[PDB]
Amino acid sequence: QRFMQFSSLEHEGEYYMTPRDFLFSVMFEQMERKTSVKKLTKKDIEDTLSGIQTAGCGSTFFRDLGDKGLISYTEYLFLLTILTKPHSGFHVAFKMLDTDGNEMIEKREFFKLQKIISKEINTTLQMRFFGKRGQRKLHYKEFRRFMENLQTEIQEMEFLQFSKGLSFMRKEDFAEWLLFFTNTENKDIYWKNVREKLSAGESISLDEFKSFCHFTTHLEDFAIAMQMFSLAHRPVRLAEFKRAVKVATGQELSNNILDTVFKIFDLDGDECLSHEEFLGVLKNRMHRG
Amino acid sequence: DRKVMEYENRIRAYSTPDKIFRYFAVFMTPEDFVRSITPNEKQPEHLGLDQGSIFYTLGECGLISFSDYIFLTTVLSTPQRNFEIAFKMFDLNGDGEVDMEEFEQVQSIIRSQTSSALTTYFFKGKLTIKNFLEFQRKLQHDVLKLEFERHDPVGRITERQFGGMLLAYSLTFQEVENFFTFLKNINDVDTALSFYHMKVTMQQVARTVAKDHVCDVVFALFNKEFVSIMKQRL
């Protein structure tokens, strides 16, 4: 919540961050910079329109924007809530904020929808959702296609950054990615198994990593699916894990990913998954701090 | 006078299903079963230590025996999503259809969260959850009807007591079952009120999140705390 760390623009004491800064805010715990905070010029606010005019509507919006954009602190919290909170509690504010007819939220209610969750000038998000002057309404469908595109963006650039630029990330690389935020007591054990008990190499793809990421972002059901076994003590073996991923998310998971997950969280289990451990790591992965 | 009421509630909450059956009962009746389910309703002085509705389609017009009681209570107390998963985790392609062995495995894992003439109906074959969830919804609709079908139908009017089914634990009947249909998918009716927070503020939530008549009998009692007892009521 001290997003001041990355904000490079200032205006009369209000600090704003460009899309580049917002991306550094999620891929970098810190960096060697001092951010050189500069007064907001009469070009940056124009560069906002410039950026959204040349940027693309897909997975690449925040990246094509580069520095041509603006993000306000409340909108930064809004975007972090998009990344961090599950895909089940945003359709409750649209229908509640657009009762006239179907769910379309006006520009004046976007500030409300932000002051609700996790709570001067127009920024990239306003200009993209409601147009250059506010004449457009934010359909819930377009906003869902936006939410998951931002998610896909962070997935792709984390893929490349942990794969160190190779087309395929290693199983040891996927292990690095999964454990990147876990700092708990068993931090050592997890890293023991990565190095002592894991068949190295073997070509995890970007589509497969996207599969695991979508599974992480649809894990609410996997919890109670797994909170069955914990109660009425009953084990969770490789077939149980496969079927539970299926019911929670409706998708196969490549055998590299499954082998990695088990070889990391078969804590003294003998082909049995320490699953509360695994869910703990997965929830460390969701909120980055 | 009322020491036995509070004692019976004590049985209804902290006692074994064996005891909750041996007191509230030799299978019970649809009138009896709701007594164990409904707190603050006494059984007669000749009650003690063995002292077309859904029920008919379990035995033969009212029969509710230990096995039926055990399994039938775990269907009004379990939510929707909690059932499907147990169904999808033991089927053998993972679509939601279970058979006698798999549905035997499902109740073991579903009942353990706590501290028979019907095997023929559901199945030999295999049963899906699209249909099972209907069995649950029917069980509820029928038991709710009976519970509020005797309280004073005189056909509801009651007013002053209707609050009391709201505080069972913790103008018609169709208006009531709709207050309980609104009332049940409630989690989002907490987040809607919590966004509206951070009395026709909600009468649209009943039509936008739950999807004016009864809205008056409730606001005269206490929102945002309303929700707590309502949720902890099932």
Author numbering:
A (entry chain B): 88 to 206, 229 to 398
B (entry chain A): 108 to 132, 145 to 170, 192 to 255, 276 to 283, 288 to 318, 320 to 335, 359 to 386, 393 to 405, ...
Original paper wording:
Mitochondrial calcium uptake proteins 1 and 2 (MICU1 and MICU2) mediate mitochondrial Ca2+ influx via the mitochondrial calcium uniporter (MCU). Its molecular action for Ca2+ uptake is tightly controlled by the MICU1–MICU2 heterodimer, which comprises Ca2+ sensing proteins which act as gatekeepers at low [Ca2+] or facilitators at high [Ca2+]. Intriguingly, humans have three MICU paralogs (MICU1, MICU2 and MICU3), as well as an alternative splicing variant (MICU1.1) depending on the tissues, and human MICU1 and MICU2 generally assemble as a heterodimer and regulate Ca2+ uptake of the MCU complex in most tissues. In particular, it has been reported that MICU2 functions as a gatekeeper of the MCU for suppressing the cellular damage caused by excessive mitochondrial Ca2+ influx.
Four MICU1–MICU2 heterodimers were observed per asymmetric unit (ASU). The heterodimers were formed by a face-to-face (F–F) interface similar to other MICU homodimer structures [Figs. 1(a) and 1(b)]. Unlike MICU homodimer structures, the MICU1–MICU2 heterodimer comprised two interfaces, interfaces 1 and 2, as a result of the asymmetry of the heterodimer. Therefore, the interfaces of the MICU1–MICU2 heterodimer contained a rigid interface 1 and a variable interface 2. Compared with the homodimers in MICU1 and MICU2, only structural differences in the interloop (L6) of MICU1 EF-hand 1 were observed in interface 1 comprising MICU1 EF-hand 1 and MICU2 EF-hand 3. The primary interactions between MICU1 and MICU2 were two salt bridges involving the highly conserved side chains of Arg221(MICU1)–Asp330(MICU2) and Asp231(MICU1)–Arg352(MICU2) [Figs. 3(a), S4 and S5]. In contrast, the other salt bridge, Asp231(MICU1)–Arg352(MICU2), has never been observed in other MICU homodimer structures. Notably, the Asp231(MICU1) was located on the interloop (L6) of EF-hand 1 participating in the Ca2+ coordination, indicating that Ca2+ binding induces structural changes directly on interface 1. The tight interaction in the apo state of MICU1–MICU2 might hinder the conformational changes required for Ca2+ binding, resulting in a lower Ca2+ binding affinity in the MICU1–MICU2 heterodimer compared with that of the MICU1 homodimer.
